[PDB]
């Protein structure tokens, strides 16, 4: 299965810096019929940021709505993704589900719409550290996987995140080893699940804190295809990291 | 005090329909020195519609994080929008208090972190039907408008939008007499809390359901001073809902 690697910027940049930014990734050369990179903006600087990234580069945004087009103030819809020729959507970041209250239903519908609509996404999961120190990791990811799985038609579309939250801002990390044995266990579910055939070509994601000295021991682990960095993304340093998946 | 005529599309538009739309828009001649004329488009297509429009239009955004730059996934800062020179910003519309969970609190934060950094804001309050059946009206929009009114002003830069809940797909219908009737509650409370000067000058708009036949009575009130229209500023008539205000 293909590699992937994606940058979620959050809620960061002003047009020079990403100008500057945009310039350091363009100095890359890869194929990218072999690698998917993706960079996710802020939704106000997508048509910015498609301009200055090279077409090696796919795009995509940070959230949508579970609702269609309507009376929805604020809110993006599947469609409107779609009209605009964005590729990719960001479902189910733990941020949403922590600020915002975001839920394993929402989840669903926000999926439901974006495959309904012709649109690829990445749906993010995982457990915290209370859940962890009880021993429900495993629990929890059947849970959370159970609430939407069975929606997904096309495995090449949709690319699962695991999200350690038991070690993102605990002070605490995540071997490359104990995020190997997750990914190896979800593959497991969405064989059970759907088939073998499926959870074969189905990407499942790092998306712990990845930086430029730990990036080549995560991709090496035979269930981990690839990552979605944050703060690392922001930084020219970038470039390194999506080598160490060529 | 200037009118002020907005048009909230929500979650509405094609490339296609906006710039068939502000084809439309752009034929009406009028005097921003006089009148104030905003459009409030989906995120993704803010920079679409301000380049399709004339600089007498003025363009603004449907929602603001109350956080800063950061790990907020899918939010928008009012940073990032200040850096974009967007003008407007719309804070505490009903579906977004009723979909999304904002609350009193929230609003005052939007609204703290938007005057820091110079973008004008479009306020909205309201009640519903179960509420206005136990005659709290009074009580309600006291206790809302209280919540950010606080001190946190320049007069021009604020305006203030009743949504009459209780009327909105309830089956019931607002006169403009039922209208005119809180919004002169609405300046009063403004007065209480920070002198007549400040509540004269300070602008209350209508944000019930407005149309090409209504708009004129409405508009005619004493203590309404425009309206933030939904639907209707999606047809090509809105140019006359704009005319009624001229």
Same mark, same amino acid.
């Given at each position: 299965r293909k590699y992937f690697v994606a940058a979620n910027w959050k809620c960061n940049g002003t047009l020079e810096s990403i100008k500057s930014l945009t310039n350091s990734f363009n100095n890359l050369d890869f194929?990218? /019929? *072999?690698?998917?990179?993706?960079? !996710?903006?802020?939704s106000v600087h997508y048509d910015h940021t498609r301009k200055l990234l090279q @077409?090696? !580069? @796919?795009? &995509?945004?940070?959230?949508?709505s579970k609702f269609g087009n309507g009376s929805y103030t604020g809110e993006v819809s599947a469609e409107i993704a779609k009209d605009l020729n964005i590729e990719y959507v960001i479902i189910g970041h !733990?941020?949403?589900?922590?600020? !915002?209250?975001?839920?394993?239903? +929402?989840?669903?519908?926000?999926?439901? #719409?974006?495959? *309904?609509?012709?649109?690829?996404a990445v749906v993010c999961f995982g457990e915290s550290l209370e859940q962890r120190e009880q021993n429900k990791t495993i629990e929890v990811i059947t849970k959370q996987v159970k609430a939407f799985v069975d929606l997904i038609d096309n495995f090449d579309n949709v690319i699962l995140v695991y999200e350690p939250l038991? #070690?993102? =801002?605990? =002070?605490?990390?995540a071997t490359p080893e104990q995020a190997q044995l997750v990914h190896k266990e979800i593959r497991k579910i969405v064989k059970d699940t759907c088939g073998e055939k499926q959870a074969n070509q189905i990407r499942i994601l790092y &998306? =712990?804190?990845?930086?430029?000295?730990?990036? /080549?021991?995560?991709?090496?682990?035979? +269930?981990?295809?690839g990552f979605l960095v944050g703060? #690392? /993304?922001?930084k020219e340093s970038f470039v390194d990291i999506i080598k160490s998946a060529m």
């Open positions: 194929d990218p /019929s *072999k690698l998917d990179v993706v960079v !996710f903006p802020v @077409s090696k !580069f @796919s795009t &995509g945004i940070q959230n949508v !733990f941020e949403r589900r922590k600020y !915002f209250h975001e839920t394993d239903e +929402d989840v669903r519908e926000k999926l439901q #719409a974006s495959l *309904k609509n012709n649109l690829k038991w #070690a993102i =801002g605990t =002070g605490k990390t &998306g =712990g804190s990845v930086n430029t000295e730990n990036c /080549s021991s995560l991709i090496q682990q035979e +269930d981990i295809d703060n #690392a /993304s922001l």
